[PDB]
């Protein structure tokens, strides 16, 4: 099962496989599985006050599979760096689930003594430790 | 009575919100006057002030000494020892301490108001529960949307050691009375809990009028499925 | 997935056990809560102990979970085990319901006791064992035999008249030592796995019949868990006993069909897949050699059975030493290029990575060489030693200095291809293998041949470069034993980067370079010699 | 023997009117053209490039006038040079001359076994011929006369004869120019 | 030290659950005069007894007097007057105490555990909040099914005055962490709050699973 | 015929693969002789290539000159002022050109083989359609796996401006034919499109039988009421 | 300038859409009087009148001859050789006219739009690929539904020769960009390719949304 | 009038035994204690704290001893001040004196209409009184004599009267301390 994409921030796992048959070589099987985890306890944006819950989740197969990381290709005698997709414009995508391996903080006003302080909280505490 | 000396750790508010947190050593049980001398292990700009004496229980002089600028060493873990020497003594009193080890991270929780409080439709009670941390020092705050609620509009209790199911752990609870019309309008209420062990020294849990549910329905489209994934 | 621990742990009642589970040292993992649950019939982990200060009532006072971030592991020390602990626990991290766990089937069994009529004997597979059995003094010269109670009926395996069973040919001996001894010993060499069971003694067919039941059990090796990264390296310190210090050592690899697939023998054998990346160091006085396998991959994880045999293949009667390799696949090792194409007469510049913690260590560049069991001698070291044959045409610069160092090798020829290794003096050692393929073509940087100057005469030598390199910085870096250093200061146009030497002295003679670099990363280079004549 | 050409509207189209024409589609034709016969030659007014299998070539003519009236035919291109033709159709224009007068000698409720004759004529118009047109017919009327007292005999009428009838003038010099509609009569048969 | 006289109401625990409820009148700061007279003007019912001196603030001979059998008069609503004297001045020390009115019953709410705790399959926290009672006193206790839990298996906070504007009310909170196996078995867990304003004197509220969910998902696939 | 001067932009293939930004200035219609002179404003490469007096149809004489260059000045927006002073003109003429502005990046589309072409199992067509890029020039290269195919195995069309949907844009196609066995086996074919407007000046799109239209999809939706991280 | 003779053929558009199949056998370059004489080996009796006497680029006089009264009824494959004359030296100029065989029928495929352009829900780019026809002559027309789109509604590249083994073949492509709403509604687009080798002189391919029937998407929901 | 109290185990119990005693649930009673009777005083022996509406409170006593035997009464608590009580049962100790001898004048197969009397006596014990217990009874036996030849008449026996009969000594000074079970008699009535 060759994994095609594991989009963490939208949390879609797309895998593919080929099932052949030793007869009539036109009924070949190409199977693609898309597993989607849909949160029911996450705000629309990643912020505290926002659209108390998100009820509409849209999953476009053309944005799950995007790869906005350059690769190296050797054409004739030289290696050249090349992108691999068009729709990865600089990021601003709004995806649903949290990234287990990435920080997600927030900033909140508070009062201390004779001053106001804009404290930084931790919406995902495990992944935010300065090491 | 018998003189007593103890080192009091800085208040958690100044630790998690204040740049500088002082460390104090308090003394009691004086005999006739206060001619005490206070010394500490470090001497990097320790411009400590002796201060004036006070009155203890049933009458007795008592003076305490404060060392400011004990934030960076506190993070590092330096040992702080306060030594007190009064004229009516032969061996000065010592009290040593250091930043506590074996810390744990609170498991903050928000609870929606009970259904039996929505029926009366006058005021609803929101509960915050910060549970399961080793050092008893915890901070609780509430917010309406993104704006902080006044410190007098919610009740926060004291940090108590919950029964030991492992290491010794501490729990705190707080409640807030909020308008039923405001609750139903669509405002979101947050509880921010602060601690030493927490990653960024703070965390928060937010709740709204839909959280805890019901018959909420959601839609997913999955536009193109046979769409040349690459 | 990435969590690795003992796939099966054995122990006995009331005996402490220790389960080590490895995880990536990512900052998320080290601070994520580590649990140790026990899946049941309800299809849900019931956390029994956690790193967040929770110990179950049942595991209270008889267990503790301690997590070491530096190693990247956590241990679950469980005391006072009982038969009811036999089950499939799960290591892991974070929330139980997710899939960041590693199933661990811990099984325990009750020990013996109160049985004084039966003996026991446990020895490592393929070793030598002996059992001593007495016979009554009344039997002076009487038949002595060993009976094997196989299932329904017993059979004779050895007698006093020289009869030897076909199943014990040449590896079983009956001994009657002198000094007035009336006791017979049965010694078996090169123990197998087909001899476990109960044996009996017998002294003739008379009424005495001084029998004594005994038991024979053979213990397999315990896999020593190794948790390495993708494209990293593994080391096997095979240190078998001295008695097999003169036997042919082999390094098998188990499979599904329980069939060996030898990776490296001591008889100059080596699987094609592991070509050019596996060493076989010579054994020391006691037999302690190191087998290094670099260039780890997804399919290079399995059970390795390093042992000894006469022919070098796994067979019954061979002492062995098991292992178990787990390739992380969540590797933090940069995926540097594995193949470098060089142009004959041109040059290369291979960026060899290391760990940033050992930036103060010293580095090594090793031409891999086969033609033997395996070897890997140094060519250049960071301290300032350069092989005799590679004078003037090899350098090892610590310029990137943030987890990588460059090795510059110019004047490539047809004999300069092949695998190469990079080494350091640190503990966290990745032996990244890079292959140099030689391709025929014009070098980008024109050398001009090696020049001679008269004493005390200014010498001007230019080297031409493409203007694709015009963006890159251009340098000369006169070569020295410790390391070449860019000459102090030179191209009028897109080509012809020059060097001028005001005077020629015996110290100026030697090798010089001309090359390009992209700020801190080096590239193609060419080399020349300057001689002095009068 | 030839593809049929139908008109989705009545062949008696008034001035500044519209009409839709549908030809019997043949799949083997990749181009279909509408040709107007004038001075014994063809003239293309509508072209359709397609392989028709479900629908049929529908052409629209708007602002009906004398120039656009006449004989229409669909020409199909088969193969590289083969041509397949169809039946012809006629389009006329109404509203160039005065309305004649039409009447009947019966009560317009004649029994199915009765005989009714229709007289169409004009007094202030020199109309050479007259044509009796029944409302709703998709084909040109077959009832015409040559004398001034245009007589139309129906003989043994039946239920199919029921309908609205009108009369239109006809000049021998203007084959496809018709006059204004005359008084309408409902010749209901029951 | 400084002389000080005070009177403390009977505890709620012994009044509601115990057999005999004391009534402590405490005098401190004397540091002498062991022959201190403790008498009450309501010299009826039971006979007042004395109490041995103890150390208060290291320099006060704290003396306490206790009057068993005070449950019935306390419920009736009698007014108690404690009297004492010292050898310093010529005036005695008198204090008064009576049961206050304007009592409002608590509004007991047993909240469910948060959903972020059932995933870990560890102890799940049930919280019980009692709100809106006038007298500072209150009992909180727990039951798992039909049996009480010893007071060391759960945590109860003190009763605190709830910041309000209309009237003075006090609220208390408690949490009991029950094994996730117990919570998922289907067992019922209840919190009893005892009070004097309640006509029944004890109100209990229960929660369990399947109390009080259903999500409908629409798929399109173009 | 008529003396006319023109300038040509540097060939893209020599600008993307490498850096050789060699220009071209062509003068056509020499009156009687080849006594022409050339001059560029940045007279750094004084040894400008003076093309031989080549002939053309209808008795036409042309002198095309090539200035060797590098991508640096060109991508930095340099101004070129090639001139000519043929005797038949009383006043020298000048031509000017430079890097084009307002460039849109191509939207490369690698399209799998058509549905009915796979049935024949003889050869399959892979189409690489660039689209929307404003400058006329673009490079299309093809790779089978990681080894680039020679330019003689695929057909690539020109860049014909597409109908104006507001602004002027171009588009090119490039078919590459593959043995059907290679496709049905599972090999991966990549199309590399190189255009000036792109960030890296290069992009690629890779397709294999797994990254095409699948005959069956099994989609499972999982709800996470507890927390959205999905380990 | 230098005189030369060239014989063309009617454009495929005229052959497949009209009766204007007029061959041409013209001369480029002329600096003499009108001493022109044209002869065609066919003697069908049609009109071979001289066309418009005009000039060409670079001050050259060009005389063109057409065949207005003949629509090229040479399906039998006539040679149709034309010879010109001039007052120049004694060497008349004749043209070469022959019909190339080995005609190959075009293979036309209509490619559904790329998914990325479907997601943006603005437009979709339907591509038509015509590959494998021997004569380098083909014309591509588009239809939306049943109405042939105007020539400004699409784009078409030239006809180029494709790499092959031995046999020679050409190819061409075209793109029609249509608003995403039109595609999603279900409106059926079509590509017509006209080539000589086809018996019917036009091949049609139709594409519309929901064209993939054999797909077996499966949707399952768990808790 | 008063809520009942019952014992789920047989009142007869040897040394080191256990018994479960059940009260009656009262809806408003917020406490249910199982009390003791000793010198007309109350000493807590059990306490169930719950508003009982679904099941009756039960109290289990183990390690039965001489001090534990006696009178048991169940006391509730209504409201803040109201007290209420329940009935009173008795539990006794057995097995501290010699086992008396029991005999039957009949054959132990007495018909349902016959009369059978049981004689319990001992020769080496000064037993003041004797009690005749029957197996299966959940409360104290109602048969007790005063004379050394303790006579217990059954009169018109029936099916319900059938069972196992035993005799136990009884001292006036120690009501809740009995002797070992006597020779069981299987009085079967058929
Ligand atoms: C470069 O000049 C030197 C002058 O000594 C020549 O010497 C040999 O260089 C090669 C390098 O490939 C060494 O392996 C030999 O050992 C050198 N010779 C001696 C005697 O040390 C060298 O031939 C010149 N390079 C050329 C001609 O390509
Ligand atoms: C761009 O055009 C220039 C025109 O001079 C080319 O430069 C010549 O390249 C050839 C290649 O061998 C050399 O022999 C000549 O000496 C070069 N001319 C000069 C003046 O140096 C250049 O090669 C062209 N670029 C590409 C990529 O073809
Ligand atoms: C520490 O002591 C200094 C000196 O009195 C004071 O200014 C400062 O506010 C103190 N900081 C604390 C108590 O955090
Ligand atoms: C008085 O207080 C003591 C200790 O708090 C307690 O044990 C006792 O039950 C109370 N009541 C009486 C009457 O002693």
Residue numbers in the entry:
A (entry chain J): 5 to 94, 97 to 137
B (entry chain B): 242 to 454, 456 to 472
C (entry chain E): 2 to 490, 502 to 546
D (entry chain S), H (entry chain R): 6 to 195
E (entry chain A): 242 to 453, 456 to 465
F (entry chain C): 242 to 472
G (entry chain D): 242 to 464
What does the literature reporting this entry say, word for word?
The ectodomain of CD89 consists of two immunoglobulin-like domains (D1 and D2) arranged at an angle of approximately 90° to each other. Map quality and resolution were sufficient to refine the positions of main chain and side chain atoms for the residues at the interface, while density in the distal region of CD89, including the second Ig-like domain D2, was of lower resolution. The refined structure revealed a 2:1 CD89:SIgA binding stoichiometry verifying that two copies of CD89 can bind both mIgA and SIgA. The two copies of CD89 bound to SIgA are separated by 108 Å (distance between the two copies of D2 C-terminal residue T195) and relative to each other are oriented differently than the two CD89 bound to mIgA for which C-terminal residues are reportedly spaced by 124 Å. Alignment to the mIgA-CD89 structure revealed superimposable binding sites (RMSD = 1.165 at FcAB; RMSD = 1.121 at FcCD) on Cα2 and Cα32. Consistent with the mIgA-CD89 structure, the CD89 D1 BC loop, the D strand, the DE loop, and the FG loop (Ig-like domain nomenclature) contacted a total of 19 IgA residues, including three Cα2 residues and 16 Cα3 residues, burying a total of 1656 Å2. A comparison of the CD89 and M4 binding footprints on SIgA revealed five shared interface residues (E389, L441, F443, T444, Q445) located on the Cα3 domain. CD89 binds additional residues located toward and on Cα2, whereas M4 contacts only Cα3 and binds residues closer to the Tps and JC, including R346, T447, D449 from HC-A and S356, E357, A360 from HC-B. CD89 and M4’s distinct binding footprints and structures direct CD89 D2 C-terminal residues away from SIgA and direct the M4 fragment C-terminal residues (and likely the rest of the M4 coiled-coil), alongside FcAB in a line near parallel to Cα3.
Immunoglobulin (Ig) A functions as monomeric IgA in the serum and Secretory (S) IgA in mucosal secretions. Host IgA Fc receptors (FcαRs), including human FcαR1/CD89, mediate IgA effector functions; however, human pathogen Streptococcus pyogenes has evolved surface-protein virulence factors, including M4, that also engage the CD89-binding site on IgA. SIgA is polymeric and is typically composed of two mIgA that assemble with one joining-chain (JC) to form dimeric (d) IgA, which is bound by the polymeric Ig-receptor (pIgR) ectodomain, called secretory component (SC). Here we report cryo-EM structures of M4-SIgA and CD89-SIgA complexes, which unexpectedly reveal different SIgA-binding stoichiometry for M4 and CD89.
